[PDB]
Every structure is written in C-alpha cells, then in structure tokens.
C-alpha cells in the first residue's frame, strides 16, 4: 500500500514499544540513539549518508512492528546498516559490519577470538536480524530521501551553496531527530528542510510572478500552516541537541 | 513468536509441481483458498556466507520496479517458518516450449503479436533503465489469454550514464558480439539482439547460432552476420576474415516475409550502436503491413 508504511500522531502514539510500557519520550530517545549509532558504524565503515538515510527508515519503520523491548536498538542498527548497504550498492562484510559495531558498543573491550563459540554466535544473531528486518518490511527496501526534493527546490529558488548546504543538513537532521519519515511524504519533508533553512539564514524566497509560493511548485498538499507546524517541532528538537545548531551557525 | 504483518507463509500456497527445469528451485503452485495458480522460487542459500544474497535483493527491487502488461508479475514475497520465496502470477507457457512443439502452429499475424509484445516489454524495462541480460526463448512466457511476458530477472541490472558492467552475461547461444569481444559498457541493445535470435527462431523453431565456446559462438556469428570489420563496426579495433553478411539468405527459406526479414536483419546488427532499437522496432513495417497482428488462439 501506499500508506502501508505512513502513520497517524495516534498511530504513533499507540505504538508496539507503548504496548510493553515504554513512554513517547523514551521511544523517542531509543529512535534517535539507534539513528546515532548507524551514522557512528556508517562513517567508520565508509559509506554513504544515502545509506546511513536508508538504515534509519528500515529503523524507524521496524520499530512501528517490533518494539524496542524485544529488539534492542544496539542489535538492530549493525543489521539494518549491513541490509542497507547492500540495497545501495556499498556491501560491506558481515565481519566488517560485527568489528564496527563491536568498537563503537565496547570501545574498551577486545574483539573475540574469530574462532570462538561467542564470535560465530553473534555472525548468526545479526544475519538472523537482517531476516527478521526484512520481513518486518515486507521486503519493501527501495527508499525515497526529501534529499532528492531538495535539489530540486534549491535551484528552483536559486539558492546559495550555502542555503542548499543547510537545507541537505535539515534533511538528514529530520532522520535523526523526528519521526516525519512516518508521517510526511519526503517532498514534504523537503519543503520543511528548505523553509527552516530559509528562517535561519533570513532568506526570504519570493512569491512567483503567477502569485503561487515556491513549494506549490514542489507538493500540492504543503500549506504554509503545516510548514510552520513542522519547522517548529524540528527546531525545537534541534534546540535540545548539543552542538547541532553550532554546525549551521553564523559566527561572523 | 515474532509478528510479521507483510511476510505470509508460503504455506498458503499448495505445491503442484516442479517447473525448475533451467539450475534453482520453482514449482507451480495453487493458493489454497482461491484456487490462483502462481510460480514460486525458491531464494537459494547454498554458499552465501555474507547473509541475504545481494543478488535477490537485485531481482526483488527490479521486479518491485517493474509493472507492465508483458512483464512477468511479482505478487508478494513468502517465509517458511528457514527459506524465501519470490511469488509470481502462473503462466502456463513459455516461447522455448511452445516452439518445440511439433502440433503447436504460428499464423505470421499471431508471430507479429509476439513480437509486438516482447519488444513493447522491452521498450519498458529499458524506459525504466534496467537491462535484462537473458534474453531466451526460455525466459519469454505466455499466459492462457496470449499475454507475453518478460520472465527471470536473476541477472537483470540497473544502468545508466565509462561504465563497468559485468561481461558473463546472456546465455552462450543469446549473446550479442560485443559481450563475446570483452565489452563492460554495453546497454539496451543487447536485449535486443536477444530479441533478434528469438525473432529468427518463431520460424526456425530452433536457435539459430548454437555455439559450444565463445570462439564458436563468435564464428557463428560471422557466417551469419558477415565478419566483424572496424569498416562495418567501426572503432571495434579494441575470428574469420572473408565472410559476408548472409543473414537474409539463410533465413530467406524459413520466413518468406520480406518485412519480417528486414527487421531480424535489423536486430542481427554487428555494431551495437548500429543495432535498432524496441521503438524504431515497433514502428517497423512488419507491424503496420498485411496480415496485421492479431490476438493468440495457437
Ligand atoms: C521463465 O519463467 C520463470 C523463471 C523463474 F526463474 C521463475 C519463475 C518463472 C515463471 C514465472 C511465472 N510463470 C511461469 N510459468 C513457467 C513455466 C513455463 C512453462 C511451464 N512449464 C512446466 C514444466 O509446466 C510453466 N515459468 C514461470
């Protein structure tokens, strides 16, 4: 379905983790340790922030069927990076994939003998979790970023680098920080990316000379009222986020 | 113990029958509330130390891609509760089948259709920048209604716009020259030689460059298409030396038509880039001459 996968404020408030007692707030937390996690291992394996992106919805779509008592974030998130690698075209080895997480859980503690019962058990339990991720997906891999939407309204608003560089960091912040991957559609997304960049660095984008905002250009549904909404639950996160807001910040 | 809302057992399907006959698992099967016929293949773990085979993931994402009349149609993926099932809707012919079959009996308006089909099919996957890979006889089906559809996408990849794709592809018998010569940037027009072969063999009844190496193969190929020359493809300096393009001499006997024999002629065309393509095919006068093409009853 193509709503199969986009979720009510209710929806997400009765969710499978709510169902064995974990509150809003912590769910919300385990959510963005898991996103936190998957761009720590991303990084030191080498690979994209396309493929960090596409990790963190198998994520947050996994965890709206299984809940966080049951899957703990630290078990899910070297699963759901390995499966994302190899759907973006960046596999990385199942050996690789174990080593990373290994240091980035237990930066003081010693990699097992490869030989060792402990070693080979934990090579199953993560191909055993890539499997169960799968199927909690419904083998529905193929993943849209507002990143894609961004292009598109960055030069249809000829924006400076500057702007556009903004924009792509709201994006991949969106990821981390919120659940909009549930709710919004990624050119909608997109738009609430380009509008907070815009109110940040006081850019103004002009109404078209046919009278029509930018972003009619970009999703039917958007309307100034939901941007405004959405910009103001994303900056509020954003203010809760030591030294995220220091990266876009002009210090000048 | 785990809940799995998009993942049903395949045991929801009845197995009738092993169809496997070209190396995998694929039986037809009956789903047993409906009665619906479909085809299920089995996603094989033998040697796959690097978890869910990347490769299935590959075919999965381009079947998922993929919705069109005359490609074959993925309904949904199974579990077995440990293996994987790609589920496929039944289609009780295939082209290979139905050509070695002696009391089986083409109309030339009935072989019109069936090219119209496979290269309108071919017209798709290529819009959607995928490229089959293994264009067979074999993997061309049919359904009770005479729907072609484009079956097996196992080797089927994603290009776009100097690439470096894999060469050990296209069986032996379906590959085109510049595979048999090293290329890594190919594109569409590979499937289209494919289609060419299969066109020739809707009147041959049997693959017309059946060859046992590549060397074979490719001196097939030059007996047939004339021999591969930078005059006739050119920059190919990157075999057999005095052969002449006799592709409508040899299958001068076979097809009669002389539409039918240009367009083949076109698919059989050395140089890729030189090689027609599934909308200039289309627009060919083999389908807007006498006998029109028309449904299939045969
Ligand atoms: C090339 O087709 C496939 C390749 C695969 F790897 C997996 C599935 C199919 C496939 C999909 C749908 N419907 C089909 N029907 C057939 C057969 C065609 C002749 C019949 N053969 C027998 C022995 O009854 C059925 N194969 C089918």
Sequence with gaps: ????????????????????????????????????L???????????????????????????????????????????????????????????????????????????????????????????????????????????????????????VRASKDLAQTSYFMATNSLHLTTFSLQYTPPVVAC????????????????????????????????????????????????????????????? | SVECPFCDEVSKYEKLAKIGQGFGEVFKARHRKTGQKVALKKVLMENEKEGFPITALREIKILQLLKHENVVNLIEICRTKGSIYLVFDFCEHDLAGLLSNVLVKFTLSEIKRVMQMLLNGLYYIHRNKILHRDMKAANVLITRDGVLK??????????????????????????????????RDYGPPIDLWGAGCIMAEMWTRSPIMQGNTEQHQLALISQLCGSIT?????????????????????????????????????????????????????????????????????
């Design chain 1, 192 to 252: 609430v990316c380009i509008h907070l960049a815009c109110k940040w660095s006081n850019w103004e984008i002009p109404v078209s000379t046919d009278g029509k905002h930018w972003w009619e250009y970009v999703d039917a549904t958007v309307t100034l009222e939901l941007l405004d909404e959405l910009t103001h639950e994303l900056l509020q996160i954003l203010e809760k986020t030591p030294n995220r807001l220091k990266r876009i910040w002009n210090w000048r």
């Design chain 1, 38 to 156: 998957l761009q720590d291992m991303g990084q030191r394996l080498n690979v994209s922030q396309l493929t960090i992106n596409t990790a963190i919805v198998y994520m947050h779509r996994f965890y709206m069927i299984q809940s966080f008592t049951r899957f703990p974030g630290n078990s899910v998130a070297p699963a759901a990076l390995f499966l994302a690698a190899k759907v973006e075209g960046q596999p990385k080895k199942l050996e690789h994939v174990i080593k990373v997480a290994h240091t980035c859980l237990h930066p003081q503690e010693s990699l097992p003998d490869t030989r060792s019962e402990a070693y080979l058990q934990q090579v199953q339990d993560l191909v055993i979790l890539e499997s169960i991720i799968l199927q909690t997906l419904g083998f529905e891999l193929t993943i849209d970023h507002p990143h894609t939407h961004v292009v598109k309204c960055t030069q249809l």
């Design chain 1, 1 to 36: 379905n193509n709503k199969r996968w986009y979720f009510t404020r209710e929806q997400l408030e009765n969710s499978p983790s709510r169902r064995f007692g974990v509150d809003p707030d912590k769910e919300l937390s385990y959510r963005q340790q898991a996103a936190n």
């Design chain 2, 150 to 183: 484009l079956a097996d996408f196992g080797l089927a990849r994603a290009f776009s716009l100097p690439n470096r794709y894999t060469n050990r592809v296209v069986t032996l018998w379906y590959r085109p020259p510049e595979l048999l010569l090293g290329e």
């Design chain 2, 230 to 298: 930078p005059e006739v493809w050119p920059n190919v300096d990157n075999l057999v030396k005095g052969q002449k393009r006799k592709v409508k001499d040899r299958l001068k006997a076979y097809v009669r038509d002389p539409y039918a024999l240009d367009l083949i002629d076109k698919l059989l065309v050395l140089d890729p880039a030189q090689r027609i393509d599934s909308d200039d095919a289309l627009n060919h006068d083999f389908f807007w001459s006498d006998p029109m093409p028309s449904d299939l009853k045969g």
